[PDB]
Design a protein around this ligand. Sequence first.
Ligand SMILES: [Zn+2]
Ligand SMILES: [Zn+2]
Lengths: 263, 818, 626
Amino acid sequence: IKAYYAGHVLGAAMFQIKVGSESVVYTGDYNMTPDRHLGAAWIDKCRPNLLITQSTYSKRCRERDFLKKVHETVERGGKVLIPVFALGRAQELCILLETFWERMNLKVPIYFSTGLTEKANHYYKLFIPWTNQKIRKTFVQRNMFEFKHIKAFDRAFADNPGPMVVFATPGHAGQSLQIFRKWAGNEKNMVIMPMQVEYMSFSAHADAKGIMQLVGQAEPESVLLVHGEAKKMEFLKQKIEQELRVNCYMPANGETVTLPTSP
Amino acid sequence: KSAALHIDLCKATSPADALQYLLQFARKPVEAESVEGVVRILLEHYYKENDPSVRLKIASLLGLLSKTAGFSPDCIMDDAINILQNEKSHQVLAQLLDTLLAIGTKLPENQAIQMRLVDVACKHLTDTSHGVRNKCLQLLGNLGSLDVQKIIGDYFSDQDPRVRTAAIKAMLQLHERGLKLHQTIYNQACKLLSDDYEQVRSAAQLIWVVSQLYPESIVPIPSSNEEIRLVDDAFGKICHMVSDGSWVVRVQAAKLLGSMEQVSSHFLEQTLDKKSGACGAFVHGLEDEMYEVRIAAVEALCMLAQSSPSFAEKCLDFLVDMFNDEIEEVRLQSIHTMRKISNNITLREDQLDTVLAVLEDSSRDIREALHELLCCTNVSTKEGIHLALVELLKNLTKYPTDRDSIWKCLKFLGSRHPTLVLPLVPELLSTHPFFDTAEPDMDDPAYIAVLVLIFNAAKTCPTMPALFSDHTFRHYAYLRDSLSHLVPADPSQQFLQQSLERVYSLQHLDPQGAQELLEFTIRDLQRLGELQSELAGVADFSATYLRCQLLLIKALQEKLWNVAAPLYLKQSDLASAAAKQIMEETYKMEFMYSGVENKQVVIIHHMRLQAKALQLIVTARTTRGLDPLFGMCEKFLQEVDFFQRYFIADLPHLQDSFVDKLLDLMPRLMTSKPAEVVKILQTMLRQSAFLHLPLPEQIHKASATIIEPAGESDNPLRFTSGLVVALDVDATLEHVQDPQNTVKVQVLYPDGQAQMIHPKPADFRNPGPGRHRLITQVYLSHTAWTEACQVEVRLLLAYNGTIPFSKPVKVYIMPKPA
Amino acid sequence: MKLYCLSGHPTLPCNVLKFKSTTIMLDCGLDMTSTLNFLPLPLVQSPRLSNLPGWSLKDLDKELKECSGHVFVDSVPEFCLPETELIDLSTVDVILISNYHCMMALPYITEHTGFTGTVYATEPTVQIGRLLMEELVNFIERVPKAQSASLWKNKDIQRLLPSPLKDAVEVSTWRRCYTMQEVNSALSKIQLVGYSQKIELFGAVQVTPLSSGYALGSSNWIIQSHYEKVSYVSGSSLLTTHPQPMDQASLKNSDVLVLTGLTQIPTANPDGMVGEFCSNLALTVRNGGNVLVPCYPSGVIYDLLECLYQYIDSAGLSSVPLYFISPVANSSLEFSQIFAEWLCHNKQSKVYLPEPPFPHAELIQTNKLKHYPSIHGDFSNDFRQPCVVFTGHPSLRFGDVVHFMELWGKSSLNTVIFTEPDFSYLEALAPYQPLAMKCIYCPIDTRLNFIQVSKLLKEVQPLHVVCPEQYTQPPPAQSHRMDLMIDCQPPAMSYRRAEVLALPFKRRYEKIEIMPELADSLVPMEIKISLATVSAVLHTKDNKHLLQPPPLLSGSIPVEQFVQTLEKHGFSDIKVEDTAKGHIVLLQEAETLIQIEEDSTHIICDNDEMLRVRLRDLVLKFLQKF
Ligand SMILES: [Zn+2]
Ligand SMILES: [Zn+2]
């Protein structure tokens, strides 16, 4: 068993299975597009017999828009929170906001509520090698996951609003669900999730172009498509047939696939 | 002594001790005849010995000897090719091919030798060992000029990747030699691009070379019937090759892709968008996880935009995204490229607000980069200029130290956008339609910034000044006199020459007149140096020389010359102090001033010799033991001999001088007793002529000024005793010949302990010509003191002793107890 | 087949292995012992060194200075590099870093020699090596000193000089310190690979590092060619140490083994030494003195401070502060903390919980452990007299240790400890000999001792073993303890500095691949075992031999069965006769002659189509395809 870096989330990896001349590779969720705190998936020219992949589916421009909106809200003094359950996206947003505030040099507050976020921060700062190269290099200067934009007490929904950035992870009735009761009720008390609202969600999974790049790099004689919409995988399989004339598969749930091999 | 080497080699045991002896002989240097002998001895022992490692070492030593500059390697080349024909071991064969590389580099002129080397190289290329194949391919690449290209091209398909890398490197070397390449190499390299390994792909640079050589050449696609130029298909190759996962290969591909500026912009626009596999190549490059790849992509964008303006207009947005980049260096370089390509593009409100956003950032250097950008950027709407000004004023409030750069920005904004500014004049000056506004606070940063913008806008436009109030004109006059560089609308030499000529003509007066003239002239020279900074070098140089002459003259008129030696008393003596001062000033003349030629060094050393003679005279006067007189006189005669042998080519131009008269009397001085010789040299020194110092063409005095402690303060650097407190040192060094070696920082504790420090050559940095910055972190420690005390630090200019070099700065230190 | 050894040091190997169509440089291994001869570099110029006397020179005494009857070089310290001139370093393509200690002097080989290949290592080794290199460069450049003594290096002067300098070997090869720019240049060429990661070189050689267990990141390499395996052993530890436990199974069935990194002064027990060191510092603190512990920021200080905090918590002497001074002290501690995967199973169990691996982070949070980049960097303000200090280089020729021990040299109340088994402490104290300072030499050596490596060899049983000649001889300190003697049933040859060794292994068969159609071409026939023969074209790319389609004949025919078949076939003119020189039969059916003779055989067949077909059928009935 040999593992290869995936970069979908911290600790995510893709496995290369080999026995004799046989070779099977299964990746699950990955992404060619690097994250703000993670590296892109990399693999040699393994050229395996079979490849299993996901078919599910302006990043810097979206980041600029999100940062500009958050900056405008905090400059105006408005309070907006980001209710998100994903740990990887939450940590990426936390790193982005922390470095943005540090670069701007201002001292506006930003905190995170749930203790699970603190546990995730502890695991992240412990496991440096599974992150982006800037994190690894800046580790020499000082720890970057630690900052004045730390933990949240919030006087249990009694510390009032302000130029604040907060994170809540409900779920669907978990976490401090009273945050909505304390906040909102007016246009100024904005609450933005994926007075206005926009889709700040970042696509952790890569698009079809990333899958095309990976299959072009590895170049297996056969490919297997799972974990995605039916339309997406059908279109991707048709595009693979049109572009490469390389054998592929579209197995349904429980479908038995058999492949000949040359030992 | 080749016999010693021969017998030592013979006595040495063959298996082990021979290797050590040859290594020891190799480390020590060698001479031409010694090389010519030891090479034959090595060849004879190479024939005699049959071990692999020993023969390998002999081949390595042959290579080392071949690199000797003074040797004439002709027969040893013949013996080398002979043993090459006879050689069997592949490692030793590769070492001998290294020696052939050495000889080919040494002598690239002989055509017969070149063809002999290439034919024997291709003969030995039949060997199965990969190393000898690599060495032979290196020889083929190095040796060329008008079949070898086809031969190495056949070896492109070799199984060993190292041989393929050697082949492509040989092709690159051959191209560097300038030979005209073929076109079949393109498809061969295209085949090489599919190779698994990284060095082969990175080297296969070769397609860039062939694309540059024949960019207009038509090439047919193997599958598609359509015809595509070499430039475009090579561009597509590099585009879909950048997707490779080898980051070094990605950086190489991006860098060499930037060097291509002979391709149509339509194809670039097609391949840069997100909607073949060549789409979004630059999108992937700028989004790449390694900042090296992104920097290389930025450079490629710079070159291509300098080629095509439409592509630049298309790619502005991606550069704006790079202004949001998390790495600071990437942001800086992207901003610099945007500045480089701003001459044609014009921004929109989105671009302008995004650019002004990153200007808010805290780091000073990126803000300076934004300032450089805005100096050249275009703009369409007056509201863009208004936004620029408002964000710049916010920046003034945040970071006032950048005021000069922002004023430069507004200068360029006004000059390059005059018409677009003046509709915004009455709002910027806040002039009321009918009221008379209160006079704005002059010397304010923001108001000066606004005025600089307005005035630089008004330089071309004639309708602008009519909207100015009276106090605006008054402030215009104020700014114009104070900030002229921002706000828009030799008798001395010949005097110095004739003064020196006056001194040279009138030196023959009596001692009183000579002293008076010398005093007046040194005063005049000092005043000229103070008055004009250009001539300060020659002025201070001449002042030091004439002060040496004055000190020599005054010493010779002292009372002790007409009192017997027993009656002499050294408490009132001035000759010893005079000699000391002349010595120090001669050292200052020699080393402090830069640009001094040999014709000045001879006179400086002559004055030093006269000072040494005076020292000998006074020491003979004060002492009474014959033996110290004999020793001192012998040492002085040794110095005279050293001087006259050092400057043999200059004695005819020192007629009637002290050293000339000493040379005329040299045998008598050498033979005579200490009393007779000291008396005759004393009376000789009195009648010595005054040499005419030749003025250098250009000369500057060296000087340093410490600025990190500044003029200090009462505040002492408290710290525990015994431990060390580090003090920063900053100084501005000017016209120092070799500051990293000659300049030494010195710190004097308030006692006899005068610690000395040698700054490392790395810390010395050169911001501009004729000067040197010096950043040092000197470390100071001492035991406990009863109270805070002052510690002195000074710059010293070392030579081959040392002299003071700058004003002695001092700082207060308070080492607290344990 | 050929092994070149460059460094004569036992624990700092520098070896080059010529293996098939590739050559591997094993380790760099900077020899730091050379610096001991030079005068130390104080951070603040001490009066003692300035007033220190020179030494007589017939040919001019400023070149050398003498203290305590030992002449020292009064110039910048210089380092003994490996004998790199023996083999052209440009030729070699791969470098296999084993540990952060062995990768020292890598800038010299990467930059000066013109080496253009690749380098491999583990991530903790790379980071800790960067820390060590930058800190030593900082120590050298803090107080620059001129190269003011060169003439002493001549062999004549060396013979004229006493034993402490005459013992030095290859003084001419010594070099001044590299610069941080060269360090940045060298580390650019390195490639990061984790434990048990197979790396293929040009499709010919497989190389893999395995967990040595000595220090985190430290690895033992193996080299494989399927039918040939060469294993390289470096500093390893079987003790209950923090890193991931030493791997033993993977080194089995190894043809040639290379042994390096055995313990200096093997008699010392590290646990007892640590306990004694704790006792020494405890009594020093009880008397009110100060303890100086020169050591690297490596694993030694880590487990030392672990046992140390445990001991003082047991004894309740936690009042005194902890001072760890180094330019990369904070970085070293944080790097140790984050690298939790490379540690042992206990640490991995600990980090499964949210708590960090090591507990000194708790001390830092509670401020019971304190560290500073240097002395001047606010440590002076926060310094207190009764304390224990870890700082500087263990060679005592540079680093903050020089200033610290100069400060505390006079007072007998204070104490200085030694824990690094890499230098003779008597030589180290020689430039500082006239002192009342109490010095204790209690090194801690966690590497494998002689009995442990002997147990390892008896458990593995490799065919051959290679090691320096130092191991082959008993140590000079004892010269009588035959128990500390590496024992091997094979001869287990050795070498000296600049000694070239030829491997005894001479395996003459490599791997190849075959596609199924060639396999199906055979039709094996029972004999007693199966026999087969094929014929294919050889294709090789990237040292991967392949067989794909575009043989001798052994037709052992018994005489009696052949006679029976010939009689049954019905051919006319059959004559059988028994005469000398074997049986000879004349057949006039087609002018054919069959001759049978010992040690020979001749076959005659005409070109007639029918006769050819009959002969082919007859042979095919009793044809063995081999
Ligand atoms: Zn997933
Ligand atoms: Zn996922």
